[PDB]
Design an enzyme around this catalytic site. Structure first.
Site, PDB file in Angstrom:
ATOM      1  CE  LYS A 124     -20.401  69.367 -67.376  1.00 31.43           C
ATOM      2  NZ  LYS A 124     -19.982  70.271 -66.374  1.00 31.43           N
ATOM      3  CB  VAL A 139     -17.561  58.147 -64.787  1.00 32.31           C
ATOM      4  CG1 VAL A 139     -17.002  59.371 -64.691  1.00 32.31           C
ATOM      5  CG2 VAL A 139     -16.845  56.675 -64.739  1.00 32.31           C
ATOM      6  CG  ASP A 179     -14.791  69.884 -61.032  1.00 31.95           C
ATOM      7  OD1 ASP A 179     -14.972  69.622 -62.484  1.00 31.95           O
ATOM      8  OD2 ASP A 179     -15.158  68.969 -60.377  1.00 31.95           O
ATOM      9  CB  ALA A 190     -18.818  63.332 -57.711  1.00 28.56           C
TER      10      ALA A 190
HETATM   11  C1  LIG Z   1     -10.569  62.519 -61.259  1.00 25.84           C
HETATM   12  C2  LIG Z   1     -10.861  62.306 -62.670  1.00 25.84           C
HETATM   13  N1  LIG Z   1     -11.916  62.744 -63.251  1.00 25.84           N
HETATM   14  C3  LIG Z   1     -11.589  63.829 -64.784  1.00 25.84           C
HETATM   15  O1  LIG Z   1     -10.475  63.540 -65.154  1.00 25.84           O
HETATM   16  N2  LIG Z   1     -12.515  64.865 -64.748  1.00 25.84           N
HETATM   17  C4  LIG Z   1     -12.392  65.409 -66.262  1.00 25.84           C
HETATM   18  C5  LIG Z   1     -13.540  66.523 -66.242  1.00 25.84           C
HETATM   19  N3  LIG Z   1     -14.904  66.026 -66.194  1.00 25.84           N
HETATM   20  C6  LIG Z   1     -16.299  66.491 -66.723  1.00 25.84           C
HETATM   21  C7  LIG Z   1     -17.243  66.735 -66.197  1.00 25.84           C
HETATM   22  O2  LIG Z   1     -15.933  67.133 -68.150  1.00 25.84           O
HETATM   23  C8  LIG Z   1     -15.194  65.366 -64.847  1.00 25.84           C
HETATM   24  C9  LIG Z   1     -13.885  64.661 -64.420  1.00 25.84           C
HETATM   25 MG   LIG Z   2     -15.097  68.744 -58.204  1.00 25.84          MG
END
Ligand SMILES: CCNC(=O)N1CCN(C(C)=O)CC1
Ligand SMILES: [Mg+2]
Ligand SMILES: [Cl-]
Ligand SMILES: [Cl-]
Ligand SMILES: [Cl-]
Ligand SMILES: [Cl-]
Ligand SMILES: [Cl-]
Length: 348
Positions: free
Chosen positions: A49, A26, A164, A30
């Site tokens: 991850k 997913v 992030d 990015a």
């Molecule tokens: C825009 C939706 N994306 C998310 O909810 N996140 C949750 C945190 N995650 C990781 C690397 O632990 C990446 C992405």
């Molecule tokens: Mg980011």
């Protein structure tokens, strides 16, 4: 110890507990080497991850430790938390890989600002939630340093989480030219004016709030200098009091080469917006960081009267960051990281 199984994901062998099923990547790179899975213990769809080369240099080993310390600490409804952390290693001696597990939401702010019509009520509730999460983050003496729409996750019910965190990551090339990675940054950090502090995150919230109200980027500069010219046209050029606080002589000299400009009338820039929204933007988008509204003060602003509840805006447990000034070897950082993996207690 759970039973682990192996499967090929992102051209690498992933080894995970049996509880995590139907893995599939997913974010198309990015977010890093992160997969979606079904967590059979909790019933949630999760992001798993696998860290790349977590212990390859002193710098990388300390970054690995910093990320795991921060994620283990953050326990708040409007901030990403750690659901699990695991390694297939059975001892420190065979420890090489680290896997982080978090909740996954459906979208980010970018995917609602671009394609949706927001009421003033939507803007109140979205900005309220960012400030509630920032009151918590700032109470632990943590600076996010990278708030922008792509770092804000939002569900069907308009509920928001911050993710992030800036882990001191961003490169010179990543901040160059016509890029969203720089448009939300406070001027004192974008141009290295002075030692910055948590006030930089409130500048970013102002830039995000303005874009939710207008549907347009507030300061879409084509480079650092174009962006500074856009900022100064809105908020005015610095007076003698702020110029004294710019520790860089050459940065001070460049500022004084620009023709003086007054602050603009924000009611004539944000045409038709709620007057209380205009008032709050004037209190966030202040050039002198000492004079910006704080997250705690902003929650009590009349713009949020509908949502504000001073008995349900919690602060963080104390956070010890003394490791940040510590000089250790690769294997010492790796041993500290191993102890944090094995001591993890999952949330209720
Ligand atoms: C825009 C939706 N994306 C998310 O909810 N996140 C949750 C945190 N995650 C990781 C690397 O632990 C990446 C992405
Ligand atoms: Mg980011
Ligand atoms: Cl399992
Ligand atoms: Cl969470
Ligand atoms: Cl391992
Ligand atoms: Cl963004
Ligand atoms: Cl601590």
């Amino acid at each position: 110890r759970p039973t682990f199984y192996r499967q090929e994901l992102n051209k690498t062998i992933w080894e995970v507990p049996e509880r995590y099923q139907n893995l599939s990547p997913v974010g198309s790179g990015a977010y890093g080497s992160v997969c979606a899975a079904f967590d059979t213990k909790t019933g949630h769809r999760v992001a798993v991850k696998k860290l790349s080369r977590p212990f390859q240099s002193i710098i990388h080993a300390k970054r690995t430790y910093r990320e795991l310390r921060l994620l283990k600490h953050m326990k708040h409804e409007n901030v990403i938390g750690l659901l699990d952390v695991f390694t297939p290693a059975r001892s420190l001696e065979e420890f090489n890989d680290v896997y982080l597990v978090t909740h996954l939401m459906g979208a980010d702010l970018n995917n609602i600002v671009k394609c949706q019509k927001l009421t003033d009520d939507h803007v109140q509730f979205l900005i309220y939630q960012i400030l509630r999460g920032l009151k918590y983050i700032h109470s632990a003496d943590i600076i996010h340093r990278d708030l922008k729409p792509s770092n804000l996750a939002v569900n069907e019910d308009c509920e928001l989480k911050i993710l992030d965190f800036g882990l001191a990551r961003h490169t010179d090339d990543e901040m160059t030219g016509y890029v969203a990675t720089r448009w939300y940054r406070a001027p004192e950090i974008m141009l290295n004016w002075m030692h910055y502090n948590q006030t930089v995150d409130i500048w970013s919230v102002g830039c995000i709030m303005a874009e939710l109200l207008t549907g347009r980027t507030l300061f879409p500069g084509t480079d650092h200098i174009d962006q500074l010219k856009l900022i100064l046209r809105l908020v005015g050029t610095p007076g003698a009091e702020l110029l004294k606080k710019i520790s860089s002589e050459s940065a001070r000299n460049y500022i004084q080469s620009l023709a003086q400009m007054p602050k603009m009338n924000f009611a004539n820039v944000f045409i038709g917006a709620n007057p209380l929204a205009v008032d709050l933007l004037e209190k966030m988008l202040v050039l002198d960081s000492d004079k910006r509204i704080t997250a705690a003060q902003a929650l009590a602003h009349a713009y949020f009267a509908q949502y504000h509840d001073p008995d349900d805006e919690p602060v963080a447990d104390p956070y010890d960051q003394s490791f940040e000034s510590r000089d250790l070897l690769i294997d010492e950082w790796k041993s500290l990281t191993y102890d944090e993996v094995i001591s993890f207690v999952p949330p209720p």
